[PDB]
Symmetry: D2
């Protein structure tokens, strides 16, 4: 993938970017390293709930994809697969418009689990939400 700028670790993918939830809501990966990665999204109605605010699930999802793909970037080539195992997001301040910018910092890279701390900020740079992401790492069945 390179539409959302997801790590290109494979020749083909089951689902194309524009068709996934990520593509649908417009998540885009910016920087991506083994210990740190970034992504953002422009707020539109698609990202909000009926009350006009960025949906709680929006932050969870951004954090989810980011931490997970960040792990994938390293282990895919190592014959492993990585999937979110636990996602704990806490909401500090709501976002009504602009963007949401996420920064994932790796804190632990075990053999079966990697852990990332994700920060989600608004356009003013305020900390609106955080997510503790736990990623299971395993060998691809395929």
């Amino acid at each position: 993938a390179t539409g959302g700028n997801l790590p290109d670790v494979a020749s083909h993918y089951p689902v194309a970017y524009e068709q996934t939830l990520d593509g649908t809501v417009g998540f885009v990966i910016d920087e991506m390293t083994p210990e740190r990665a970034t992504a953002s999204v422009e707020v539109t109605d698609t990202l909000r709930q009926r009350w006009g605010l960025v949906h709680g699930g929006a932050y969870c999802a951004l954090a989810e994809m980011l931490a997970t793909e960040a792990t994938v970037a390293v282990v895919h080539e190592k014959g492993m697969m990585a999937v979110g195992q636990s996602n704990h997001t806490s909401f500090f301040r709501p976002v009504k418009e602009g963007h949401v910018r996420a920064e994932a910092v790796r804190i632990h890279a075990g053999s079966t689990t990697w852990f990332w701390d994700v920060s989600l900020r608004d356009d003013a740079g305020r900390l609106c939400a955080v997510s503790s992401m736990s990623i299971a790492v395993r060998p691809r069945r395929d």
Copy 2:
């Protein structure tokens, strides 16, 4: 629309435009202590790898738990928003449906807590979410 609680005359975002309406979440039952919702698995719900996005489960539970709280407190001059969402993934979903069930466990003055269960078409437990909802007096 998604059958969310009708508590106000106007909503800033129409269902079909919201994240919920975009992925297709629908509320089935709704009582003060328990609520259910579901969605058909489509690609809008998946990640590039073909599985239901972890964030989808998160979003389902979030809306369900929050909306079930709103259903009660709105009429009381209060607002409800998610404050914490902890989702744990036990088994992946490739296709079909995702069904959630929210069971209220605590209803405090400032916080409501709900245990949400997300099952696949076989009835298997695919994920869980502990939803913590902040309850506060509505702002003018």
Copy 3:
């Protein structure tokens, strides 16, 4: 062990009950099955914080030991080891005195992780706290 009524899965243990944190604070396992287990403790100062209430960590620990030992009861004999991997405890109502009674219900038993929902109640039966416990299961290095 049988002092705190922990599962006797081994001939010997590195640390004796009365000397562990559990023995020290007085945790006692009541019922114990593959899908469900119970334990309680009598509140004393040892369980409280300076302000007179049951220490937040007290609930976390009870839940921790219970879920973990409950898993141990099944897999030890299977050559695995089990350790807490994640413990998420939420506090609803404080306890000043009496007991804390915990009930762990198994919700997921995977090959690498088991998950238990723990309820912690007071003497009136009120729900004072809950803990989501995630237990890693692995083969004993030894």
Copy 4:
């Protein structure tokens, strides 16, 4: 005693009797945005298997995050208590010490959030705890 914040003239439980004093927790630094504490590993801190009890890490973070909040809000007529404690375990501790560092990430009117890091004598990250503290007006 454990060097907890001296904010009141009387405390219902003396340090040495509390859970904290029993296992040996001690506050080292304390500022509004950051605090540290530590404990010597002894058997009172371990489980039957010889490792530091998961609950010990939980307890350390709990007290640290809560007490660092109290340090500020008490004098303001408020009370602080843990509302959520999520501890994740990365590497076990058999002996030595456990050192915690709490970094304040959010300070709201009703909720303060702290990221706590628990390291072993080698400085390795053994566990983390996300502490959510409820802040409320003190009761008469």
